[PDB]
């Protein structure tokens, strides 16, 4: 007769439970604990990296240009038979006496060449004084001075061969380099000198190239140079080396070798560096830098380091400086500065810091720090980046776990408390609770604390019918609150008496009756929709859609983090760098090699 | 007699609460709000980086090889007294007239040398000027041409000296380079020329120190060159500079200095660049690039930039181009392009974009953009990476906070609503609720809205006993639903009457009785396990394990993100790159450096 | 009379609901599912990068120094008329016979020069054999040997010109480098040679032409060199090329061209490399490396690669090696090694791995792998970093989504179950539940399953009054549990009878009465605070603050991840690299280029 409007829903019948099945609720679970916090030491660190260093210094050169020329005189014309050009060293004596003090130089050159002592006279004059003047201007040049502008050719005699001599004294300032602190350091030309800026009265290597009298090398102590141009005199003395090579004499100031070089560089200063002890290793993270470094716990011998006085020198300087500014009132130092080597070959100097508040701790901390305290070069990697990645990675990870962990605990605790609610709740409606718990529809009743359960049998939607009239003829004055129904499990046959219950439960028995009333209008969950009864009478059927909905649940909107691709990005390619400067190794090289071909002709061979 | 099987659990007794303690539930808490969303402007940006680079151009050289040789004739043999080789400039006139137009060149050279005008006649014959032909093939060479293959020497006359002269005209192409305008640009030799292609009356440069003799430099306007090889004539005129140096004459095309030079490079184009305003700074993020840039709000003066016309030129080009493709229908431009300088020294040009939909906004946006609008070089860092890190970091952070924040709100709201459930729940069972809330077992009853509470006293597990028979002799026909028990607080003494309650509560009074029934089987929470009663009679005891469990709680499985280590990774070690820069190392490096020493003559002196 | 102490709270009245409004609870929502896990293949990979490579090789040079000098004898003194210096090739025959086998050289030189065959004799007397002896020491040399220490000038005769000739045999290892795979290569001396080891003698190269007579170039097969110094004989033969240039003869060992040069380098080995198939691309992630690579699915032709035999050679070597150590028992290989090209131009060789457990799978996997299997150089980027970023980014993202996703499901499930609790709960107190659900105060009653609702009307705090005495005169022996009140909606007028209800509900009707009792003390929610009644009598009023609070809610503390800034950080910067060097490249170049300017002598031109 009246069949459910809405097919979609299902129906169940639930026989009363018996002994046979019983179950218990789980008791509250133990909760996770938040991890002990990591402890961070405060401190100041400076970082050092490996360095080049070249050797660079200044020098002066004194040499003279000796030229002799031959001329043949033709009737109309003249021709050069040949021109001879030499360089002559200026003597130690001449340099000091003539050039340096006076600034005046001598025209004539007297030097050994080819195991012969040759002499030249300028402009075959009487020996005369010459006054040096600065060299003609050129861009990007060092200073230089020269006596003689002009060349001297023999006076004209017809049909004769003649020789003429010129001398030009030259002095120049030199930039000197030593690729390897060694026998040789180089001149502007790249003309080599076998001498060293370092030496130096005393050295082990003193032996190395000396089986000697003085002879060539001479040192003046307490040398005061005077500027040629200014003719100012040096305020302070130096030790002046002069080496006389056959071509020329060079002079420079002597300085002790060791302090000159030294290798290591002080990359950066971190006001706040944190040291962490994890994993049997140390972490130093610079917040600003956003780098983290990993080091062994043990400290790194400075003594091991070669040439590297500087490191201590710098380290204290920065540390002292930093402490005063930021630290001074605020914090107290613990222990003395410490050095660690970190992957990437960065050397870290650390100065642990203690807060004033903490200060009582100071004794204990000091002891620990001290225990840490215990020639090769250190190689450094070009790329920081890994440290930065480490820095970034850890921090983010730090947050994620921390926040998530809290949630988990919150979740767990929430569940435990909730159980209390559920316990009572099941009491009110064992079926509803039982069904949800099991996850299937079931019938249950409480036996004592424990709850019995039995499963329910589905009934076809098709086979359900609702009775038209709630009210009871037999015993008037009473009306049953809920509808009655008929149904059967299988299609073919029998019809079963029964009545409706909450959530489409067909209860076999029709116990529950209430006093009749007026204005008695109700809705019942029937099938997909609701069945509508009015005045204990059948009305129409509805669907859920008709009725406005409200939601128990609290919404959460969670979205994924979408994927991203990182494409190779570089300011510079390898090629670009090579191209960059200067300009090209390749371009230059191609040009240079070519040079002989274009300019000079080897080629011609003839039978 | 009947003692609990399962020790593990505890027992409590809970006396009824009095006035003395009362507590209230907390009221719902205020919830966090989701942050206002960040606003992002759309736009198109191009990025620029610093670049040096130096200047190159083509040039041609005309010079002649003048050689004179001496021979002595021995009886059998001949020997060279000596060979003289010179270069002679080819005259301006000769170049234009002879070489250029005709392509023919002449044997004879006439130039000043050593303040003398010397002349040479090639292969001393009454003069001929044959022609030029291309130079012999070489790899990686520029073009060149030369009149004379062979060298000429005097005919043999015995026991006499003779002189012979040769002339070979040479013309060559080849590249020229000028780093920057000053003073000289370089020719192949490593010799220099100082002329400037660059200037230019309309330039400062003329001022720079000048000799100057008029003659040497000459400019031809409306020059049409003809290719020597092809003998094609140039379609279009150029301005041809020729400079005659004593060695040679060089010619090239004059070009205005400025447009050639200039600097900064257009690194990349971003179709979609987002500008964000945070922190009193700007963020530009390129999604594809995955870089973010930080800039000051204020714009960066282009005028400040030195040599840098290009930037505008490029910027518009890209922007216009980009807009049409992607943007054209879709979006409308706002304002004119804007430039910002970002850390890392990247210059960003930005063109703000507006959507069509938004367009009404357009007036307002325009005003804001405009307000932004307000010689040095800009230095750029090699490494992008920090920006990328920033890009990566922010995005991830963005997600994490966003998602988490939502959860927190959801959590909060959930709690508030839950309170409603709890309020009723406590009503049903004040003890259970009260206990959980307090976190200890307590007894409570409701006085009005407020709930009173009192604490409970633990009872020893050992001292508890259960009565065998539920049923009551005295008043038959009634049976007590729950078991009765005896217990005492302390070991030694007295026994107390009492009965069981939920969760091992020993209630002093034994009120609650129900009608007797059959099939009355129940479980009670007793100690660790359950006590089993059948038919109002004692049966056996059980443990919890025996009974299958169901769980209220909804599981969550949360796992930590495990630590990771980043080890230094590099494609290239520094050395390898240097190795790449040709070429490598040690033995050669040893050899080369030495060169001056050995070749310069140490060996000895003869007095 | 008695008005609320605490203003802050509001009051409501709730008329009974009617038909007019009804609502339903939402049914449980479908839950999200956890994504299918990604599948990862295990495998071993090696990575390769692009390489430079240069050519370098050893050489030997044999040449002689031929010098002739002229002297004029002055009365006292002597002078050099001139000195002639030449280099003479040492003959093929001489080298093999004399120098190589004997280690002896000859005084005389005989070579063609200037199309004349000149000869020189040393010491002019006539021949005696000369043993070679090592050259004088210099630091950083290659080896060399020379017969003759000293130079010769003719015996003195007065007023005569005389000639003297000197010959010094010289041999030197020298280093050789060649830019190009074909002929041209250069000495350490830097003189160019046109020859080359490079070509495998049978090669394409034969066609490539330099054409000459046979004599100059000769090859010896089965050459055994003997060390000059040691005078050891070579154990094993080589093929010895000798080229005789006019200046000198050079010899080196011939080797096949191709294998020498070749390309790509084997960057790294990854024990565990994971391949992932996503996005129509492959991901290889190295855990240790913390890089991820993206590749096309298809494999990359090795054959395409130019010079690159090595790759296979290395790849197998590592793979075989790796497998045994880690893999050997543990895993089984699938298929043969495979190669992919990844962005960044890294070539990846992959060897898929299968576990033993899985092994049944083996057939299927093999088929898939095989299907993948299908002259240019590959360019590689300097910077890994993007891959690392990708690696980092993905992993973190992986965690975040995974964990969060779980939470969402947990949340959803939790809500559904909770609904069960709510359903019953509303039953107990429809108003409280209804109000919360709606979010405003409302009145509701249950009609059947569905709940009716109506809204409530706020009442002024001001207009509420409480009745002093609970107890009822009329019917003594009964006392009303809750207080009675009077109120009115608006200020001016009427007073309404009513009574208190939970949460400041003023119920119009005063139904609910309980038996009178003693010790009847209660609290009622009144206004902000509580009203206190004792013994069914009015006492005083309180505030909430007075009473201690307990909280239902489970706390969560969630904090944001704070922003971070990454500042540009570079251990290595472009300038520093360029500088890095001794003295330094930039400084070199500026100085070097300058050289002509300062040194060169125009100096000036005059008539």
Residue numbers in the entry:
A (entry chain C), B (entry chain A), C (entry chain B): 103 to 476, 492 to 724
Give verbatim lines from the article.
Glycoprotein B (gB) of herpes simplex virus type 1 (HSV-1), the prototype species of the alphaherpesviruses, is essential for virus entry (Turner et al., 1998). However, gB alone is not sufficient for entry, but is part of the herpesvirus multicomponent fusion machinery (Cai et al., 1988; Campadelli-Fiume et al., 2012; Forrester et al., 1992; Heldwein and Krummenacher, 2008; Ligas and Johnson, 1988; Rey, 2006; Roop et al., 1993). At the other end is the “base” region formed by the three domains I that contain the fusion peptides, and the three domains V. Based on this domain organization, gB was assigned to the family of class III fusion proteins; other members include glycoprotein G from vesicular stomatitis virus (VSV G) and the baculovirus major envelope glycoprotein gp64 (Backovic and Jardetzky, 2009; Heldwein et al., 2006; Kadlec et al., 2008; Roche et al., 2006). All class III fusion proteins have a membrane proximal region (MPR) at the C terminus of the ectodomain (Backovic and Jardetzky, 2009).
To this end, we determined the structure of gB bound to liposomes with cryo-ET subtomogram averaging. Ectodomain trimers of gB lacking the MPR interacted efficiently with liposomes and formed a coat-like layer. To study the nature of the gB-membrane interaction, the structure of the gB-bilayer complex within the coat was determined at pH 5.5. This pH was chosen because the FLs in the low pH crystal structure seemed more exposed and thus possibly in a conformation more relevant for membrane insertion. In the final refinement stage, gB trimers were allowed to tilt relative to the membrane, resulting in an improvement in resolution to 2.7 nm. It is apparent from the structure of the gB-bilayer complex that the protein binds to the target membrane as a trimer via the base region. No density connecting the two leaflets of the lipid bilayer was observed consistent with the interaction being limited to the outer leaflet. At the protein-membrane interface, where the gB base interacts with the lipid bilayer, a tripod-shaped density with its legs at a shallow angle to the membrane was evident. Fitting of these elements resulted in the three domains I moving closer to the membrane, separating from each other and orienting the FLs toward the tripod legs. It is clear from this fitting that the binding of gB to the membrane is mediated by the interaction of the FLs region with the outer leaflet of the membrane (cf. protein-lipid interface shown in Figure 4L).
